[PDB]
XYZ file of C-alpha atoms in Angstrom:
330
model
C -11.401 78.408 -26.983
C -7.971 76.865 -28.155
C -7.602 74.075 -31.531
C -4.545 71.724 -31.947
C -3.733 69.582 -35.570
C -1.208 66.927 -36.199
C 0.488 68.243 -39.696
C 2.561 65.511 -41.585
C 4.539 65.778 -44.776
C 2.820 64.634 -48.129
C 6.110 63.000 -49.169
C 9.682 61.747 -47.967
C 11.020 65.236 -48.698
C 8.548 67.162 -46.862
C 7.617 68.870 -50.070
C 4.329 70.350 -48.379
C 2.467 69.204 -45.174
C -1.018 68.424 -44.751
C -3.316 68.705 -41.861
C -7.048 67.068 -41.394
C -9.950 70.382 -41.162
C -13.844 68.613 -40.581
C -16.049 70.725 -42.921
C -19.470 70.806 -43.225
C -22.568 68.656 -41.108
C -21.991 65.607 -41.462
C -18.072 66.891 -40.983
C -16.461 66.282 -44.145
C -12.686 65.699 -43.407
C -10.406 66.874 -45.860
C -6.002 66.855 -46.057
C -5.211 70.336 -46.793
C -2.087 72.216 -47.165
C -2.142 74.878 -44.274
C -0.203 78.397 -45.869
C 0.248 80.851 -44.123
C 1.628 82.909 -47.596
C -1.842 83.278 -48.918
C -5.529 83.213 -47.456
C -8.412 81.419 -49.206
C -9.209 78.437 -47.473
C -10.763 76.658 -50.921
C -11.187 72.915 -51.931
C -11.743 70.431 -53.938
C -15.239 69.491 -54.292
C -17.988 68.005 -56.005
C -18.073 71.085 -58.858
C -14.586 70.681 -59.735
C -14.725 70.003 -63.970
C -13.943 66.031 -63.626
C -10.650 65.503 -65.531
C -8.612 67.607 -62.898
C -9.337 65.799 -59.891
C -7.633 62.544 -59.385
C -7.623 61.333 -56.392
C -8.135 64.026 -53.828
C -11.022 63.936 -51.109
C -13.764 66.072 -52.090
C -15.681 68.720 -50.344
C -19.992 68.157 -51.175
C -21.823 70.829 -50.001
C -25.383 68.936 -51.298
C -24.951 66.463 -48.174
C -23.781 69.125 -46.001
C -27.100 70.560 -43.765
C -25.274 73.521 -42.829
C -23.094 74.388 -46.580
C -24.909 77.964 -47.461
C -24.246 78.762 -51.495
C -22.672 82.870 -51.365
C -24.260 84.312 -53.603
C -22.468 85.823 -56.355
C -19.663 84.892 -54.632
C -16.275 83.822 -57.169
C -12.832 83.651 -56.124
C -9.299 82.819 -58.490
C -6.058 82.982 -57.426
C -2.512 82.522 -58.841
C 0.537 81.375 -56.780
C 4.328 82.183 -56.679
C 4.471 78.609 -58.035
C 2.632 79.184 -61.464
C -0.006 77.019 -60.175
C -4.011 78.164 -59.895
C -7.723 77.396 -58.692
C -10.700 79.441 -59.202
C -14.671 78.718 -58.229
C -17.148 80.325 -56.090
C -18.382 79.895 -52.837
C -20.320 78.328 -49.473
C -20.270 79.253 -46.039
C -20.068 76.210 -43.577
C -18.696 74.973 -41.047
C -15.132 74.206 -40.548
C -13.594 72.672 -37.446
C -9.728 72.072 -36.918
C -8.153 69.897 -34.374
C -11.343 70.520 -32.332
C -11.340 74.422 -32.478
C -14.784 75.476 -34.425
C -15.613 78.452 -37.168
C -18.880 79.261 -38.079
C -19.849 80.613 -41.149
C -16.431 79.997 -42.721
C -16.252 80.781 -46.424
C -15.340 77.605 -48.030
C -14.459 78.690 -51.615
C -15.720 75.633 -53.995
C -12.613 74.693 -56.567
C -14.242 74.566 -60.694
C -10.976 74.870 -61.942
C -7.611 73.714 -60.281
C -4.291 73.829 -62.647
C -2.363 70.758 -63.499
C -0.224 71.266 -60.058
C -2.708 70.137 -57.953
C -4.520 68.029 -60.057
C -1.285 65.656 -59.600
C -1.415 66.006 -56.044
C -3.335 63.146 -54.987
C -2.492 63.365 -51.505
C -3.438 67.730 -50.549
C -7.212 68.441 -51.248
C -7.362 72.199 -50.876
C -5.923 75.316 -49.085
C -6.761 77.044 -45.306
C -5.011 80.036 -45.996
C -3.675 82.069 -42.564
C -1.808 85.051 -44.445
C -3.815 88.962 -43.917
C -7.208 88.860 -44.731
C -6.693 91.595 -47.576
C -5.116 89.110 -49.463
C -8.164 87.135 -50.512
C -9.335 86.838 -53.316
C -13.443 86.491 -53.053
C -15.267 89.243 -55.470
C -17.372 90.845 -54.172
C -17.229 90.917 -51.077
C -14.049 89.953 -49.827
C -13.967 87.134 -46.854
C -12.245 85.904 -43.917
C -9.489 83.884 -42.994
C -10.069 80.568 -40.098
C -7.647 82.355 -37.959
C -9.729 85.753 -38.350
C -12.612 84.334 -37.889
C -12.083 82.169 -34.825
C -9.504 84.924 -33.076
C -12.291 86.310 -31.147
C -12.498 82.864 -29.601
C -9.355 82.173 -28.776
C -7.501 82.031 -25.018
C -4.875 83.971 -26.883
C -5.409 85.441 -30.418
C -2.110 82.825 -32.697
C -1.842 80.405 -33.600
C 1.771 77.964 -34.025
C 3.585 76.277 -36.590
C 5.823 73.470 -35.709
C 6.619 71.574 -38.248
C 9.196 68.729 -38.392
C 12.212 67.168 -40.603
C 10.934 64.234 -41.947
C 8.004 63.697 -39.365
C 4.982 65.212 -38.068
C 4.272 68.345 -36.233
C 1.628 70.984 -34.833
C -0.131 73.060 -35.883
C -2.165 74.930 -32.572
C -4.751 77.778 -31.866
C -4.744 80.047 -29.031
C -1.951 79.151 -27.041
C 1.183 78.329 -26.637
C 2.534 74.611 -25.835
C 5.344 75.840 -23.718
C 6.366 72.300 -23.731
C 6.847 72.385 -27.107
C 9.944 74.494 -27.686
C 13.679 74.808 -26.046
C 15.015 78.345 -24.770
C 12.752 81.092 -24.929
C 10.615 82.578 -27.481
C 12.523 86.143 -29.293
C 9.692 87.805 -31.259
C 10.162 90.289 -33.847
C 8.234 93.017 -35.323
C 5.734 92.314 -38.855
C 5.161 94.571 -41.820
C 1.208 93.537 -42.777
C 1.636 96.054 -45.554
C 1.804 93.670 -48.436
C -0.787 91.163 -46.788
C 1.948 88.813 -45.192
C 4.064 87.367 -42.009
C 6.910 89.472 -43.519
C 9.658 90.392 -40.838
C 13.489 91.358 -40.706
C 15.908 89.197 -39.966
C 19.376 90.468 -38.750
C 21.452 88.187 -40.532
C 22.959 84.956 -41.457
C 25.909 82.192 -40.784
C 27.299 79.388 -43.042
C 27.686 76.946 -41.147
C 30.733 76.988 -38.387
C 31.574 80.559 -39.682
C 31.218 84.034 -38.700
C 27.490 85.589 -37.993
C 26.783 88.479 -41.120
C 24.885 91.019 -39.590
C 22.323 92.165 -42.971
C 18.722 93.017 -42.397
C 16.695 90.140 -44.718
C 12.919 91.443 -45.533
C 10.555 88.076 -46.082
C 7.916 85.848 -45.664
C 7.316 82.832 -42.769
C 5.076 81.214 -45.526
C 4.275 77.339 -44.292
C 2.876 77.210 -48.219
C 6.287 77.366 -49.954
C 8.460 74.256 -49.649
C 12.443 75.798 -49.859
C 14.033 79.062 -48.189
C 14.361 81.841 -50.792
C 16.858 84.485 -50.007
C 19.027 86.976 -51.703
C 21.534 85.692 -54.789
C 24.644 87.110 -52.381
C 23.551 84.961 -49.503
C 23.141 81.584 -51.538
C 26.068 81.843 -53.343
C 27.692 82.369 -49.931
C 25.844 79.462 -48.295
C 26.404 76.816 -51.961
C 30.045 77.732 -52.167
C 31.252 75.963 -49.548
C 29.011 72.403 -51.064
C 31.781 70.838 -53.211
C 30.483 70.572 -56.666
C 27.513 72.712 -55.915
C 26.582 75.549 -58.545
C 23.262 77.151 -60.236
C 22.128 75.014 -63.224
C 20.086 77.405 -65.447
C 18.146 73.862 -67.280
C 17.796 72.560 -63.772
C 16.067 75.974 -61.887
C 18.350 76.481 -59.227
C 20.978 75.441 -56.963
C 21.819 71.792 -57.100
C 24.883 69.215 -55.870
C 26.285 66.311 -55.632
C 24.087 63.611 -54.055
C 27.385 62.155 -52.099
C 28.106 65.849 -49.861
C 27.283 66.901 -46.629
C 25.685 69.814 -46.071
C 26.509 71.972 -43.668
C 23.802 74.269 -41.782
C 22.384 77.412 -42.603
C 21.756 80.722 -39.420
C 19.559 83.107 -39.674
C 18.802 85.740 -37.191
C 15.835 86.913 -35.046
C 16.811 89.566 -33.375
C 19.826 88.916 -31.509
C 18.800 84.918 -31.477
C 20.272 82.349 -34.053
C 18.170 79.684 -35.595
C 20.093 76.337 -36.782
C 19.068 74.400 -39.869
C 20.846 71.609 -39.890
C 22.187 71.065 -43.083
C 20.337 67.578 -43.941
C 17.275 70.003 -44.207
C 18.710 71.465 -47.051
C 18.960 67.862 -49.477
C 15.784 67.827 -51.305
C 16.793 64.643 -53.328
C 17.838 63.515 -57.270
C 16.579 65.856 -59.717
C 15.162 63.059 -61.233
C 15.056 60.072 -60.360
C 18.093 57.379 -60.419
C 19.826 61.496 -61.206
C 23.056 62.136 -58.899
C 22.986 65.879 -59.063
C 20.581 66.592 -55.804
C 18.228 70.109 -55.278
C 19.688 72.659 -53.004
C 16.993 73.558 -50.217
C 17.913 76.995 -50.366
C 17.736 78.775 -53.402
C 17.765 82.483 -54.567
C 14.707 84.812 -54.907
C 16.696 87.403 -57.359
C 13.549 86.294 -59.855
C 10.280 86.350 -57.157
C 10.722 89.849 -55.893
C 10.495 88.966 -51.535
C 12.178 86.871 -49.952
C 10.187 83.665 -48.330
C 10.557 82.058 -45.531
C 9.540 78.687 -46.485
C 9.566 75.227 -44.551
C 12.683 74.637 -45.061
C 13.412 77.302 -42.655
C 10.326 77.234 -40.422
C 10.356 73.540 -39.131
C 13.627 74.467 -38.318
C 11.632 76.568 -35.257
C 8.797 76.582 -33.734
C 7.143 79.818 -34.807
C 4.007 81.934 -33.154
C 2.078 83.874 -35.838
C 1.066 86.716 -32.714
C -2.003 88.467 -34.081
C -2.951 90.590 -31.680
C -3.912 93.848 -32.258
C -0.195 94.670 -33.909
C 0.578 91.119 -34.930
C 4.504 89.332 -34.746
C 5.844 86.515 -34.986
C 7.971 84.677 -32.237
C 10.427 82.234 -33.025
C 12.232 79.442 -30.872
C 14.954 76.570 -31.381
C 13.113 73.285 -31.025
């Protein structure tokens, strides 16, 4: 089997991407944030505290003839941005782009934190990291990819995120028309539950490539590119007027600037992030200070190849017995 679904930016900055997902019988379609940095499929629901729902589409398990309460199961998650959610668990039929999994754990939110409530465009998350990170207790549950893997033509999914434009998530096949050149594969460590890999270095604009190992995670659920402070300082030093602002929470730059590109290494191959992809717009409405898309990871504990980096590439998440990641230009 295969599946193919379009993923669409939630706003003009590409702050996140939503993909339609069918849950239940008859189908209830929710727009979920596919997140290769977490492993819970959770949704706003008929059980979510009413004051914490503000425009999202909800899953109502009582209206699904295939929904079954997973007795005793609860979940609770906190994300790197400080947001969180928790609730109980159903199993139900879940389909993405024509690919169907029966008995998928659908984690129904009873509580969500304010940032979820405030984002009317995201109806929940669909985790695509490794199932060892799934938070369901007392019986940990499998991700949608893990449940579908054995049925897929090839045990892979691909992320093709657009810049200010829709893109595609495919399951079970590699669309050879979707990228240029060849796909370069690189090793993955699953020891932390992430799609964790080692970039071979970077370049700023037309500058020379610096060979240096950068361990980080391929995370479609993080907006920006978070890298070591040395790397980020080298980038922003090429932008007149750029500075790290403690009050804003990162590097800012004059909105009048033209940003240089940033290149990262995948083995001997190179992925080029155009400068425009690094512009996240005014820090507040009407400001001439703009927020940078490359930020320091020093306060995180891990480097994150988020959407800013991934949307410059066609990315293969290879779930073979030994997982690997593949990157191609496009």
